[PDB]
Design a protein around this ligand. Structure first.
Ligand SMILES: *[C@@H]1O[C@H](CO)[C@@H](O[C@@H]2O[C@H](CO)[C@@H](O)[C@H](O)[C@H]2NC(C)=O)[C@H](O)[C@H]1NC(C)=O
Ligand SMILES: [Ca+2]
Ligand SMILES: [Hg+2]
Length: 444
């Protein structure tokens, strides 16, 4: 079945090369030689049922001293493999290879040349161990629907990916193009920030969340926290950009070092103003995937401008004020920084997340594995913000077991350069991608 498969060099497409039997230790009929000109190669024709990730090994004889080789997957970029000795036939690890459902090619092209190739062995990459996900939320007093949401997420983890979108009107536009609706909708508490309210900002974020909760959906809430003070309010740096380090002189380290000041008083004014909106959601029975202090490690937001320690301390202020003081039990705490120095701690983080903005609709494998290492597989990993919706074929192949994905709004989801309607349909109509339809009755 799904195991090591050797492909003998003799039984392949030879371009300016020949089959030989002089050297000792080969497998099969013989081996391939005649690596003079640059155009000389071995084109192996391999096929797969689905799109999988295989490990590559080359069986070579470097009798003309140590040489270098070019490996080509489906007429793509070269990959130099070094052959160190050699007196006999031995094997080298040539990294990983992603094969697409159907016909594929693995060429061994003359680089330095003057070597003998016996065979190539493709082994399907190691299946990931079952995730050791924590069964319960950090808050012991967690309400019914938060406890339900966490269990449902825990049950689907590694099996499927929950589709998600930033803003309800964008979730409706997806239904207009794919006939499917994101299971998860993310809303921003941004226009609830007193600093912004003071300048006339209104928000329907609580209205949109409850609407989607009534449609049987999952709700994610982030907060673009506009600093209470320090607003430059310049033509270049307007008050409405007040969440940016660039737009405020607001020093969180100073503010936390002086807890009896006015700066710290206004900070709690802001947390309590937002707590009014969350309590309003709690009373409405809406479980929330609460994601405050997002992209902290980046430092482009005032809450991560003074480095990791003030950021972590603020996370714990929010956790004490919202969980203990305001007594909010509908919140599932989602951390949004990859770095260990920035990680607050396992006792205040329920689910780990990342914001990845790279074109191509890839599995964002590297970021997923970084968080696997961070939460040591005890916490679920989510793609809290993506620019490009991930393809389920690649998510599965690279075993990038993201719990959910949430494509950002304007200039991303509706931007053909990031997401085409074609790719959207492909993703939204997959048996791997859970839509609104498919998640119905999760609260039962
Ligand atoms: C309260 O916060 C404000 C905003 O960060 C602080 O005011 C700024 O202070 C710096 C010096 O530390 C000045 O360069 C700015 O011009 C001030 N801005 C304004 C609009 O006044 C204020 O100092 C903080 N209070 C404390 C005790 O640190
Ligand atoms: Ca052979
Ligand atoms: Hg609106």
């Amino acid at each position: 079945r799904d195991g090591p498969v050797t492909y003998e060099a003799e039984d392949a497409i030879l371009t300016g090369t020949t089959v030989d039997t002089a050297q000792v230790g080969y497998t099969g009929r013989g081996y391939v030689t005649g690596f003079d000109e640059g155009s000389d190669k071995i084109t192996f024709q391999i096929s797969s049922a689905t799109t999988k990730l295989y490990d590559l090994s080359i069986r070579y004889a470097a009798i003309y001293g140590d040489k270098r080789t070019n490996v080509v997957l489906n007429n793509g970029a070269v990959s130099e493999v070094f052959f160190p000795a050699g007196d006999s036939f031995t094997s080298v690890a040539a990294g990983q290879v992603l094969l697409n459902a159907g016909q594929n090619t693995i060429d061994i092209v003359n680089n330095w040349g003057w070597y003998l190739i016996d065979s190539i062995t493709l082994t399907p990459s190691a299946p990931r161990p079952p995730h050791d996900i924590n069964p319960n939320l950090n808050n012991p007093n967690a309400d019914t629907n938060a406890k339900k949401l966490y269990s449902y997420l825990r049950s689907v983890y590694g099996n499927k990916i929950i589709s998600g979108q930033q803003e309800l009107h964008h979730a409706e536009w997806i239904r207009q193009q794919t006939g499917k609706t994101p299971a998860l909708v993310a809303v921003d508490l941004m226009d609830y920030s007193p600093s912004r309210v003071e300048r006339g900002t209104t928000s329907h974020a609580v209205e949109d969340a409850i609407a989607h909760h009534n449609a049987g959906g999952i709700v994610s809430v982030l907060w673009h926290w506009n600093a209470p003070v320090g607003l430059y309010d310049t033509e270049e740096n307007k008050w409405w950009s007040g969440f940016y380090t660039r737009a405020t002189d607001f020093d969180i380290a100073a503010t936390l070092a002086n807890p009896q000041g006015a700066n710290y008083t206004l900070l709690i004014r802001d947390i309590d103003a937002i707590a009014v909106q969350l309590k309003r959601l709690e009373a409405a029975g809406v479980p929330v995937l609460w994601r405050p202090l997002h992209e902290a490690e980046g430092g482009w937001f005032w809450w991560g401008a003074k480095g990791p320690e003030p950021a972590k301390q603020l996370w714990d202020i929010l956790y004490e004020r919202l969980t203990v003081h305001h007594g909010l039990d509908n919140l599932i705490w989602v951390w949004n920084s990859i770095l260990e120095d920035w990680y607050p701690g396992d006792d205040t983080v329920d689910i780990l997340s990342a914001d990845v903005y790279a074109q191509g609709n890839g599995p964002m494998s590297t970021q997923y594995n970084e968080l696997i290492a961070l939460g040591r597989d005890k916490k679920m990993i989510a793609a809290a913000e993506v620019g490009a919706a991930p393809l389920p074929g690649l998510l599965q192949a690279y075993q990038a077991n993201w719990l959910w994905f949430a494509v950002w709004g304007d200039d991303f989801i509706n931007n053909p350069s990031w997401n085409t309607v074609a790719v959207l349909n492909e993703i939204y109509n997959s048996d791997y991608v859970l839509t609104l339809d498919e998640i119905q009755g999760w609260r039962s």
